[PDB]
């Protein structure tokens, strides 16, 4: 059981942090804010990979909706939360080698697992998009 | 009743739509407007880019699809060669501001006509455009 | 400028509420003094550590009900390296009852008040409240913020 | 016929304390039987039984307890009754791990307590007139 307006502002904080990382700002450490554990690693590489090929993403989040926000704590150690977020976004990879070819428009739901830092920061842990280089790589 | 290359005309706008991004976006490159822009349309988007950059707000948009409806090269008076591109633009944007944790966004499809002036080097730049159908920046400031 | 940007109000409220949960644990009957070190350090710690240590040895505890908390302002400063600073002012509306055996009745309070917190990132990125400044035996007012 | 203000205050100060333990995590429904009778009983036993079965518990902080005019007149024939009017300024929080948030409140309110002296040395609160789960724990 979780506050959805907290969930909608926690992921919108993330999607905006994803954009700040993947993009011409090229801030990888921005991940360290809201990202941790498994998810930070892949997006740390991905933000640094696009920074390796000198490519960057332009993100626009059209709308998000939290379908189910729930809190569970497993064992004695850690607090965690699952957030199912219906996410409709579009992004284009601007590349120097193959300019302007890139684009995508996705409308999808995604399930986020995140840990509560002792600070209560609610950094993101891992996620997978539900099915029900590449420019579709950041659909998170 | 005059030609324009729809493969060229689309490229001018595809190269332009990226220029609006790099200028309004977090890189905030205002000089890059001067690359593809000229005359009134340069001053308008110079004002917007520099305005949003002074206010510490940066624009974000993805251009979904570009269609060229009509493209003509008329030279009008002897002064210079000109072009009229009617382009159907499908794009969405959210101006990213630190002030609000929620970024206001738009998704719009519209047809916007451009006029251009071929320079001495023979490169087409955008002097003026109209979209038929120190202040807060509306989400629709960047359209086209 | 000079690396000053607003913190997320969500980052703030869910961050602050963590301190209030710490204060209730440290100054309540559970007397978690270790809990103080979680979200506190440097100045604010030693102040509140000594209090929750005092309330432990004097066997007095604080009962907290915290009405709606609001974040008035949240900002991120820069320190040293590029990160690791912040100043956030929240409006705290709470009722605290100090249970002290010795005194005849537990004295409550009801105070709506604005307080300034200072928060740092320490080595690995994590935030801990460094100091607290309220703007306008044992007492019930010892516990505020 | 006005009550000793001490005689009245201890009656309510007890009830407020009885009310806190009943709706708290200790979830003592029996405590309502001590200091209540009739409507105060039925309404508050169902409520405490409600929160007990829903695993909800209230939290309470009573800031200031005050007595307005507290008067006594005999109940019909042998029984005796009393009116105690009290200003209650209290804060409370209903904690549900279910639901996103606990619902706090702070309410300063007048509530008329109609009591009867039980036959043997005892007083019971028999009525309250104030002029799922909500913050309905008041008075």
| 3-state DSSP of A65-115 | EEEEEEEECCCCCCCEEEEEEEEEEEEEEECCCCCCCCCEEEEEEEEEEEE
Angstrom distance (rounded) from CA D64 to CA D15: 14
Interchain contact, D105 vs C66, CB within 8 Å: no
Q: How far is CA A33 from CA A61, A123, B96, D79, in A?
A: 19, 7, 18, 70
- Cβ–Cβ < 8 Å for B116, B68: no
Taking phi first (over 0 means left), then psi (-120 to 50 degrees means alpha), and beta for anything else, what does residue B79 get?
Answer: alpha
Cα D83 to Cα D115: distance, rounded to the nearest angstrom: 6
The number of residues making up chain D comes to 139
Which H or E run contains A15? helix A4-21
| Chain C positions in Cβ-Cβ contact with residue B101 (cut-off 8 Å) | 8-10
Instruction: Give the one of C65, C94, C96 whose C-beta lies nearest to D92's C-beta.
Output: C65
DSSP 8-state class, residue C35: H
Q: Rounded to 5 degrees, what are φ and ψ at B140?
A: -95, 5
- How many other CB atoms sit within 10 Å of the CB of residue A102? 18
Query: Can you tell me whether residue B8 is helix, strand or coil?
Result: helix
Distance CA A54, CA D38 (A): 78
Distance, in Å, from the CA atom of C115 to the CA atom of B100, rounded to the nearest integer, reads 22
C141's tokens: 């007012």
The tokens for A93 are: 């990879």
Nearest to A21 by CA among A42, A39, A46, A38: A46
Among candidate residues C121, D11, C111, D37, the one with its CA nearest the CA of residue A123: C121
B84, B115 Cβ separation under 8 angstroms: yes
**Inter-residue contact D120 to D92 (CB < 8 Å):** no
Q: Tell me the sheet residues that pair with B118.
A: B124
d(C-alpha B113, C-alpha B81), whole Å: 17
Cβ contact B51:B37 at 8 Å = no
**In whole angstroms, what is the distance from residue D56 CA to residue D33 CA?**
20
Tell me the backbone φ, ψ of residue D75, rounded to 5 degrees: -65, 165
Please report residues of D whose CB lies closer than 8 A to that of A66: none
| Interchain CB contact of A71 with C (< 8 Å) | no
Please tell me the distance from the alpha carbon of residue B104 to that of residue B138, in angstroms, as a whole number.
9
R_g (Cα) of chain A, nearest Å: 15
Question: Which single residue is written with the structure tokens 């249970």?
Answer: C99
Q: D45 and D10 in contact (C-beta within 8 Å)?
A: no
* Residue of chain B whose Cα is closest to the Cα of C7: B98
Q: Which of A1, A3, A6 sits opposite D97 (nearest CB)?
A: A1
Q: Would you say how long chain C is, in residues?
A: 145
Task: Select from B53, B98, B99, B100 the residue whose CB has the most chain C CBs within 10 Å, as the one to mutate to test that interface.
Answer: B98
Alpha carbons C57 and C50: distance in angstroms, whole number = 10
Question: Is C9 at the interface with chain A, CB within 8 A?
Answer: yes
Find the largest Cα–Cα distance for chain A: 51
Distance CA C143, CA D68 (A): 32
DSSP-derived 3-state class of residue C33:
coil
Say how many residues make up chain B.
Answer: 144
Residues D23 and D60 sit within 8 Å (Cβ to Cβ): yes
Touching pair B, D by Cβ (3+ pairs < 8 Å): no
Dihedral (Cα; D28, D31, D33, D35), 10-degree rounding? -150
Name the E strands within A1-55.
none
Tokens linked to D14: 């007890």
> Which tokens hold the place of B83?
């072009």
What's the alpha-carbon Rg for chain D, to the nearest Å? 15
What does the block give as tokens for A54?
């000198």
CB neighbours (10 Å) of residue A80? 16
Contact B101 C5 (CB under 8 A): no
Q: What is d(CA D41, CA D2) in angstroms, rounded to the nearest whole number?
A: 25
For helices A4-21 and A37-52, what crossing angle results, to 10°?
Answer: 30
Which residues are CB-contacts of C106 (< 8 A; sequence separation ≥ 6)? Answer: C63, C97, C98, C99, C100
Sequence-ordered strand ranges (E) for B51-94: 57-58, 61-72, 82-94
CB atoms within 10 A of CB C105: 10
Q: Which residues pair with D67 in a beta bridge?
A: D86
Task: List subunits contacting chain C, requiring 3 or more Cβ pairs under 8 Å.
Answer: A, B, D
For residue C99, what are the contacts with CB-CB under 8 A and spacing of at least 6?
Answer: C29, C60, C61, C62, C63, C106
| Distance (Å, whole) CA A57 – CA A51 | 10
Q: Answer for the pair C33, C119: CB distance below 8 angstroms, yes or no.
A: no
Identify whether the C-beta of residue A130 lies closer than 8 Å to the C-beta of residue A111: yes
**Rounded CA separation C16/C134 (Å):** 15
The answer to whether B121 and B109 are in contact (CB under 8 A) is: no
Within an 8 Å CB–CB cutoff, is residue C34 touching chain D? no
Task: Quote the tokens at residue B93.
Answer: 């944007």
- Looking at the complex, report in whole angstroms how far the Cα of residue C141 sits from the nearest Cα belonging to chain D: 14
Show the tokens assigned to C64. 């907290």
Q: Supply φ then ψ for residue B22, to 5 degrees.
A: -60, -25
Question: What is the three-class DSSP state of C126?
Answer: coil
Q: Distance between CA C14 and CA B136 in Å, rounded?
A: 29
| Coil, strand or helix at C49 | helix
Evaluate whether D139 touches D130 at the Cβ level (below 8 Å): yes
Q: How far is the alpha carbon of A103 from chain B, nearest alpha carbon, in Å?
A: 7
Query: Which residues make Cβ contacts (< 8 Å) with residue A27, sequence separation at least 6?
Result: A20, A21, A47
Q: How many CB atoms lie within 10 A of CB B92?
A: 22
* Gaps in chain D (C to N distance exceeding 2.5 A) after: 131
| CB-CB neighbours of C108 under 10 Å | 19
Q: What is the largest CA-CA distance in chain B?
A: 53
Identify the H or E element spanning D42.
helix D39-53
Q: Which residue stretches of chain C are H helix? A: 9-27, 34-39, 42-57
List the determination method. X-ray
Contact D43, D34 (CB under 8 A): no
Q: Which two tokens stand for residue C91?
A: 């409006």
- Hunting for tokens 């428009």 — which residue is that? A105
Task: Region of A100 please: left (phi>0), alpha (psi -120 to 50) or beta.
Answer: left
Mutate to test the interface with C, among D66, D104, D135 (most CBs of C within 10 A): D104
Between residues 99 and 138 of chain C, which touch chain A (CB distance below 8 Å)? 125-128
Three-state DSSP state, B66: strand
CB A91, CB A135: distance < 8 Å: yes
Q: Which two tokens stand for residue B39?
A: 């005359």
Residue D115, domain extent: 1-139
Helices (H), chain B: 6-24, 33-36, 39-54
Q: Are the beta carbons of A140 and A110 closer than 8 angstroms?
A: yes
Residue D104 forms beta bridges with which residues?
D93
Shortest CA distance from A7: residue in chain D: D100
Residues 6+ apart with CB under 8 A from B100: none
Taking an 8 Å cut-off on Cβ atoms, the answer to whether C8 and B101 are in contact is yes
Q: How many domains does chain D have?
A: 1
* Tally of helices (H runs) and strands (E runs) in chain B: 3, 6
Q: What is the resolution of this structure in A?
A: 3.4
User: Which residue in the block uniquely carries the two structure tokens 């993403």?
Assistant: A57
Q: From residue A78, how far is each of A11, C10, C143, D122 by CA, in Å? A: 20, 20, 28, 51
CB contact under 8 A, D98 and A1: yes
């Amino acid at each position: 059981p979780m506050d959805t307006e907290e969930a909608e502002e926690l992921v919108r904080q993330w999607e905006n942090v994803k954009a700040e990382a993947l993009g011409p700002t090229h801030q990888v450490y921005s991940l360290s804010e809201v990202l941790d554990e498994s998810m930070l690693v892949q997006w740390q590489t991905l933000a640094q990979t696009a920074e390796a090929k000198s490519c960057y993403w332009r993100f626009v989040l059209l709308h998000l909706e939290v379908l189910q926000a729930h809190i569970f704590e497993d064992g004695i150690a850690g607090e965690a939360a699952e957030i199912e977020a219906l996410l409709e976004e579009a992004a284009e990879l601007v590349d120097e080698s193959q300019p302007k070819n890139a684009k995508y428009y996705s409308t999808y739901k995604i399930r986020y697992i995140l840990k509560k830092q002792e600070d209560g920061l609610w950094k993101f842990c891992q996620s997978d998009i539900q099915i029900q280089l590449d420019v579709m790589m950041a659909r998170g």
